[PDB]
Amino acid sequence: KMQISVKTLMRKRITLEVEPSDTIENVKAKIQDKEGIPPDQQRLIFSGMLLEDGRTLSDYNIQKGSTLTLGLILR
Amino acid sequence: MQISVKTLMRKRITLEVEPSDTIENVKAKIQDKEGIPPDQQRLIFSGMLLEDGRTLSDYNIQKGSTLTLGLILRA
Amino acid sequence: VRTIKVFTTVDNINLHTQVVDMSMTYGQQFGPTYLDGADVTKIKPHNSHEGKTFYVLPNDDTLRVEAFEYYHTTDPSFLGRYMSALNHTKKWKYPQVNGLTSIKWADNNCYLATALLTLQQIELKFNPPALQDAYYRARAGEAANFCALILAYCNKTVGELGDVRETMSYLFQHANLDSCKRVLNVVCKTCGQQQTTLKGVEAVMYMGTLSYEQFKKGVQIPCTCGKQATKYLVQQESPFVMMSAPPAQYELKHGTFTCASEYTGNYQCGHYKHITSKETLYCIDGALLTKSSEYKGPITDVFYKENSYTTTIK
Ligand SMILES: [Br-]
Ligand SMILES: [Br-]
Ligand SMILES: [Zn+2]
């Protein structure tokens, strides 16, 4: 029959467990194991700052309980 | 420690509808398939908010068209 | 504390519910706040507002990703520019002339007329969802939102005179140009030849001749010896091609092109007109339409329709 398709932006909330000295590459990999999103298709945002793929949590002053927002680059 | 990242990923789902069903009927087709309730559902097609009392045809929603779903977030 | 329910958004697709105090101005609680064109940053909320929708600059990362997956920009000053210019384009008029949505002249919008009319004639599919849902509206006779995005994607201000050759370069980088590939070949009498193959935005744009028919035959460029080279089109795979050149008297012939643009005016102060090859040459000047049998004029850009071509030059 008909084949209508809807574009979505589903929202969720996950809880990572990390040591405040890991790298965003290490944090990106925890997302992969926990949800399945590859690190290459992973874009992270924290207070306006695009999370660099080699910087560590501390170089961005990440707290305990502070929440980051994850998007994926257009692919 | 105990860090949480919010995930807002994009998806594309394919509903099966007839070209005479209502936006109330289409909104409910999202509900069974994804779980977003119709009250928290905003749908847009070709730059136009789909009113909750018009049929697909009232928008020329032909077989193959792409709709956009938005969400009335709360807090 | 007197409050009301109102929605903040960045894309007018995902609305965020907000409760606002009726003492402090919008700009105190939300930051810069625009309501469908109007800058309401320094004004207090009124009772009539409950149930409306406001546009706000993205302040929280939840909004940055929302406004990045719809406008495809990282620039913090995009919604500031999109909303600053959409207040003006909403006041313009978009006459439907010759089955096409044009723009009635105001604030030196000459180039947006030819640009918008050319887009309805060549095959373009935009990658950003903002352009995706605003072009759709533009083809239905209402392009208020569409011309605002172009005024932001090109970083031009309402009133700032603009160039069509450059204005279409920004839309093309935000368009589905992936299966477009052009292979050029250059031949010097003493060096032999070199083949260049370029794909994407540069496979539909060229500056140096308006006659596509010439591009197959060749155009002459300086060589690395001190001598003359000859450059010619070997292969072209693209739904269309843009040929552009500095304004000059060029003659357009029926069924030879798809549409063109004319620059009748002086250097750094001018006016654009649009010529399209329907059954007979139509000259679309925004809200005025005049047909003619032939068109000899100061044409600067010519658009040709293509599917796939392979040169016959052995
Ligand atoms: Br609407
Ligand atoms: Br020479
Ligand atoms: Zn040479």
Residue numbers in the entry:
A (entry chain G): 0 to 74
B (entry chain F): 1 to 75
C (entry chain B): 2 to 315
Paper's wording?
To better understand the mechanism underlying inhibition, we determined the crystal structure of SARS-CoV-2 PLpro in complex with UbV.CV2.1 at a resolution of 3.5 Å. The complex revealed that UbV.CV2.1 bound to PLpro as an asymmetric strand-swapped dimer. Structural superposition showed no overlap between the monomeric UbV.ME.4 inhibitor bound to MERS-CoV PLpro, which bound close to the catalytic site, and the dimeric UbV.CV2.1 bound to SARS-CoV-2 PLpro, which bound to a site far from the catalytic site. However, there was overlap between the N-terminal domain of ISG15 bound to SARS-CoV-2 PLpro and one half of the UbV.CV2.1 dimer, suggesting that UbV.CV2.1 inhibits ISGylation by sterically blocking the interaction between PLpro and the N-terminal domain of ISG15. The contacts between SARS-CoV-2 PLpro and UbV.CV2.1 result in an extensive binding interface with 1063 and 1040 Å2 of surface area buried on the protease and UbV, respectively. The binding site on PLpro can be divided roughly into two halves, which we have termed subsite-1 (412 Å2 that predominantly contacts UbV) and subsite-2 (651 Å2 that predominantly contacts UbV’). Subsite-1 involves hydrophobic burial of one face of the PLpro S2 helix (residues 60–70*, PLpro residues are denoted by asterisks throughout) by the UbV subunit, analogous to interactions of the N-terminal domain of ISG15 with PLpro. Met9’ points toward the solvent, but Arg10’ from UbV’ makes a salt bridge with Glu70* of PLpro. In the first region, residues from strand β4 of the UbV’ subunit interact with strand β2 of the Ubl domain of PLpro (residues 14–18*) to form a continuation of the β-sheet, with 4 mainchain hydrogen bonds between the two strands (left). Most importantly, mutations in subsite-1 abrogated inhibition of the polyprotein processing activity of PLpro by UbV.CV2.1, whereas mutations in subsite-2 did not.
